[PDB]
A paper describes a structure:
In this work, we focus on the study of two plant pan-allergens, profilins from the rubber tree (rHev b 8) and maize (rZea m 12), in their monomeric and dimeric forms.
A backbone alignment of the two 3D-structures reveals that they adopt the same conformation, with a root-mean-square-deviation (rmsd) of 0.27 Å. The sequence alignment shows that the principal differences are between residues 37ANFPQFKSEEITGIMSDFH55for rHev b 8 and 37ENFPELKPEEVAGMIKDFD55 for rZea m 12. The assays showed that mAb 2F5 specifically recognizes monomeric rHev b 8, even at a low concentration (2 μg/mL); conversely, mAb 2F5 showed no reactivity towards monomeric rZea m 12, suggesting that this IgE recognizes a conformational epitope on the surface of rHev b 8 that is not shared with rZea m 12. However, between the monomeric and dimeric forms of both allergens we observed a significant difference in the IgE binding (P < 0.001), which suggests that the monomer has additional IgE epitopes in the region that establishes the homodimer interface. When the cells were stimulated with monomeric rHev b 8 using the same and two fold the concentration of the dimer (130 and 260 nM, respectively) the release of β-hexosaminidase reached near half of the homodimer, and the positive controls responses P < 0.001.
Author numbering: 1 to 131
Write the structure that this text describes.
Amino acid sequence: MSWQAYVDDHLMCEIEGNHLSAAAIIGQDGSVWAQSANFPQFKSEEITGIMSDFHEPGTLAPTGLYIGGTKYMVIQGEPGAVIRGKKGPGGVTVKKTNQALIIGIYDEPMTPGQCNMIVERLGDYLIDQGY
């Protein structure tokens, strides 16, 4: 398995007829492991902001979750494990692994639940592989 294969075939594949708009596997230092064509470049402090929220859940919500300069409202996630964001009919799921981040960005008609499922299920599988 390449990381590009995990992105192309396991994150960017169909789920219930829908597809993520973009996806990435990113080291917690901010190093891209692999990403899709339209996944944005992270801006400064963005990865740091994400990790601080995993470390202290609730830190990010007041100011918002930023990815590629796009602001998402933080909605309910899983403390220290999953960050979820909403932006109108779109949003994002960030799933923490031991040393990486699995990220999916969706837009209508794809649902939050579909994005959560495809992103979080791969994260759990990669965690059990020691990643």
